[PDB]
Amino acid sequence: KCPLMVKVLDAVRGSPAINVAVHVFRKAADDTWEPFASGKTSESGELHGLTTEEEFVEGIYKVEIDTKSYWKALGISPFHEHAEVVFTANDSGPRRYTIAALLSPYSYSTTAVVTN
Amino acid sequence: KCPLMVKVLDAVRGSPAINVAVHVFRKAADDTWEPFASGKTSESGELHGLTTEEEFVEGIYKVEIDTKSYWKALGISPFHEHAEVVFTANDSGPRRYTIAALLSPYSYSTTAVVTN
Amino acid sequence: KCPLMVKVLDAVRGSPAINVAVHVFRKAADDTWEPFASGKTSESGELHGLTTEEEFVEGIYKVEIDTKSYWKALGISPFHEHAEVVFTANDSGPRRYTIAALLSPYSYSTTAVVTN
Amino acid sequence: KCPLMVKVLDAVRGSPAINVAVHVFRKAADDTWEPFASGKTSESGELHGLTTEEEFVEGIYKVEIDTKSYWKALGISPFHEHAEVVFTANDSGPRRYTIAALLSPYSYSTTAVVTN
Ligand SMILES: O=C(O)CCO/N=C/c1ccc(O)cc1
Ligand SMILES: O=C(O)CCO/N=C/c1ccc(O)cc1
């Protein structure tokens, strides 16, 4: 089952953050960021199916959550351009990665839930 | 389906917070706190089945999460006695309440996800 | 020289949370919450001068931050009644405590900074 | 008089996060990240003196907080490589920015306090 999931919540409305664009990148050997996967959060604030076990190999990944566009669509002026979560994915440890983000106009928190 | 759910995460280990005691109270007419429901978080960090739609009427509720005992069992010295979430439950609005808590030894955050 | 300080920030506006009422209680020998100190946050979101080292003895304290009133004055209907921070203080000799809170309408986080 | 300040707290120890490396970048006209300023947090968890009002012109800035190195020195293997805070600055005239970060091994939150 999916090894990388993203969950986004809205701390102003107390709801999933719906239709949030999410872009994932993998760090290339020349230290640049290579597009890897993308999607939009669902009505439950979740984004599944970004990648597969076969392709999600060890390496450094960046998950960019397009928070600015989200707040603009709600008519709220935000601080950040996006929320960026940068981490190393590794094999000897819990398999499923869930990247959770809690959004406010001038603040955000992000948490990783790593389980098998 | 269940109108009050609790989800607890551990920000040190990146995992659900398992076997965390949770006590819910309702505010009585004499302004005291009346025991209402309790349980222990599951292996997924979740506590379901605390109450039913029929009994969960409008009023002020307190959800106490016994964080101190959780950290002590992990051998970590914590700051808080517990995390307390106090809110009014109301009928004209999203039906399902999810009280989420993210735990660290000297900090915690709590968020409400209200949906129907 | 202030042993107990409270700092509150607004995650919607990216500013200190001004004029937030704060009530402090201490658990008495008969297990009730006795009023200990109160005040309001300043223009900087800070509340100083609640107590003195002499009066701030060992005990279990509860810091109640009146978030609901804060949001109502901004025209926002928030989820929580207040943020409650409960902790044992000075059980290993005197310490200085800063209780920080970050507020959003449906979420808040609280951290403690403890120094000798 | 400092227009850009960084404050970092440790949610495990309940203390300022000391000696945390911070790198600031500004997006150049060719869309690359140009080095802008860097430093390390003090005993109070604060980093001041990164720039001057004159040099801190309008632009998109990225504040990279080197959290992984911080946790490794404490013997903790954390999830994130660093915390990245990306924002447009001074697009409506000069402002003063405080970028605050609260760190846990598998979680972090960042807030901005912006004043005129
Ligand atoms: O049960 C749910 O819907 C929430 C599951 O994911 N949320 C995680 C989370 C919640 C609150 C935080 O301050 C940080 C992370
Ligand atoms: O006591 C101290 O050292 C200063 C307290 O300032 N707290 C700032 C803060 C606290 C929690 C956050 O999630 C973001 C910023």
Give which of B53, B50, B31, B52 is closest to B42, Cα–Cα: B50
The SS3 of residue A28 is coil
Task: Tell whether C62 is in a known binding site.
Answer: no
**Pick from D25, C114, C12: nearest CA to A71:** C12
Contact (CB<8Å) D13/B104: no
Query: Hey, is the C-beta of D12 within 8 angstroms of any chain A C-beta?
Result: no
Find chain D residues with C-beta within 8 A of C85's C-beta: none
Is the Cβ–Cβ distance between D6 and C103 less than 8 Å? no
Is the CB of A9 less than 8 angstroms away from the CB of B111?
yes
For residue B30, what are its two tokens?
Answer: 């004499």
Q: Which long-range contacts (CB under 8 A, 24 or more apart) does C68-72 make?
A: C69/C20, C69/C21, C70/C17, C70/C19, C70/C20, C70/C21, C70/C103, C71/C103, C71/C105
Q: How far is CA A6 from the centre of its chain?
A: 5
The SS3 assignment for D70 reads helix
In whole angstroms, give the CA distance from residue C82 to residue C69. Answer: 8
Contact B60, B99 (CB under 8 A): no
| φ, ψ of residue B67 in degrees (nearest 5) | -70, -35
Of residues D89, D22, D68, the one with CA closest to residue D49: D22
Q: Report the distance separating Cα B97 and Cα B106, nearest Å.
A: 26
B7 Cα nearest atom in ligand 1: 1
Binding site membership of B52 for ligand 1 (Cβ less than 6 Å): no
Residue whose structure tokens are 């293997």: D77
* Cα C105 from Cα A14, distance rounded (Å): 8
Nearest Cα to Cα of residue A12 among C66, B20, C13: C13
Measured distance CA(D28)–CA(D17) in Å, rounded:
30
Find the ligand nearest to B108 CA.
1
Distance of alpha carbon A79 from its chain centroid, rounded? 18
Eight-class DSSP state of B19? T
CA distance D81 to D88: 23
- The answer to whether C52 faces chain B, any CB pair under 8 Å, is no
One-letter amino acid identity for C71? W
Q: Ligand 2 in contact with C102 (CB < 6 A)?
A: yes
Q: SS3 for D65? A: strand
Those chains having 3 or more beta-carbon pairs within 8 angstroms of chain B are A, C, D
| Distance separating alpha carbons of residues D90 and D82, to the nearest angstrom | 25
CA D83 centroid distance within chain: 8
List all residues 6 or more positions away from C109 whose beta carbon is below 8 Å from its beta carbon.
Answer: A109, B102, B107, B108, B109, B110, C101, C102, D102, D109
Q: E-assigned strands of D28-95?
A: 33-40, 46-47, 59-65, 80-89
Q: Using alpha carbons, select from B80, B69, B66 the residue that is nearest to residue B8.
A: B66
Give the HSE-up count for residue C51: Cα atoms under 13 Å, Cβ half-sphere: 26
Query: What would the two tokens of residue A14 be?
Result: 């107390």
Closest atom of ligand 1 relative to the A111 alpha carbon: 15
Q: Is D6 exposed, middle or buried (0-12, 13-18, 19+ CB in 10 A)?
A: buried
Q: Taking CB atoms and an 8 Å limit, are A106 and C79 in contact across chains?
A: no
Residues written for chain B: 116
**To what resolution in angstroms was this structure determined?**
1.7
Q: Provide, as residue numbers in chain C, all residues whose Cβ is less than 8 Å from the Cβ of B90.
A: none
The owner of tokens 């632009």 is: D59
Q: Give the SS3 label for residue C27.
A: strand
d(Cα B31, Cα D8) in Å, to the nearest integer?
A: 40
Decide whether any atom of ligand 2 lies within 6 Å of the D18 Cβ: no
Q: Are B37 and B29 in contact (CB under 8 A)?
A: no
What separation in angstroms does the CA of A47 have from each of A4, C76, D106, D110?
Answer: 9, 29, 20, 23
Secondary-structure breakdown of chain B: helix, strand, coil percentages, each rounded to the nearest 5: 5, 55, 40
Tell how far CA B103 is from the center of its chain. 12
User: Count of CB atoms within 10 A of residue A32's CB?
Assistant: 9
- Number of DSSP helices (H) and strands (E) in chain B, helices first: 1, 9
Residue A39: name the closest of A55, A18, A15 by CA: A18
Query: Contact, B85 vs B65, CB < 8 A?
Result: yes
Residues 6+ apart with CB under 8 A from B83: B64, B65, B67, B101, B103, B108, B110
Tokens of A11: 């701390």
In DSSP terms, which residues pair with B111 in a beta bridge?
Answer: B100, C107
* Domains of chain B in sequence order: 6-115 (2.60.40.180)
β-strand partners of A98: A5, A113
Q: How far apart are alpha carbons A52 and A69 in whole angstroms?
A: 28
**C85-114: b (≥16 Cβ within 10 Å) or e:** bbbbbbeeeebbbbbbbbbbbbbbbbbbbb
Cα(A59)–Cα(B95) distance, integer angstroms: 42
Neighbour-count burial of D17, counting CB atoms closer than 10 A to its CB (0-12 exposed, 13-18 middle, 19+ buried) = buried
Mutating to test ligand 2, I would choose from C4, C5, C7 the residue with most ligand atoms within 8 A of its C-beta, which is C7
Dmax (CA) of chain C: 43
H helices then E strands: how many in chain D?
Answer: 1, 9
- Which chain A residue's Cα is nearest to D103? A109
Note whether D105 contacts B13, CB cutoff 8 Å.
yes
Distance, in Å, from the CA atom of A87 to the CA atom of D105, rounded to the nearest integer, reads: 12
> Would you say A58 is a known binding-site residue?
no
Map residue C68 onto helix, strand or coil: helix
Q: Report the atom number in ligand 2 closest to the C-alpha of D109.
A: 13
Asked if residue B113 has its Cβ within 6 Å of ligand 1, the reply is yes
Number of Cβ atoms within 10 Å of the Cβ of D12: 20
| Alpha carbon distances (Å) from C57 to B4, B6, B79, C85, C91 | 38, 35, 17, 17, 9
Cα→Cα distances B98→B46, B47, B92, Å: 10, 10, 17
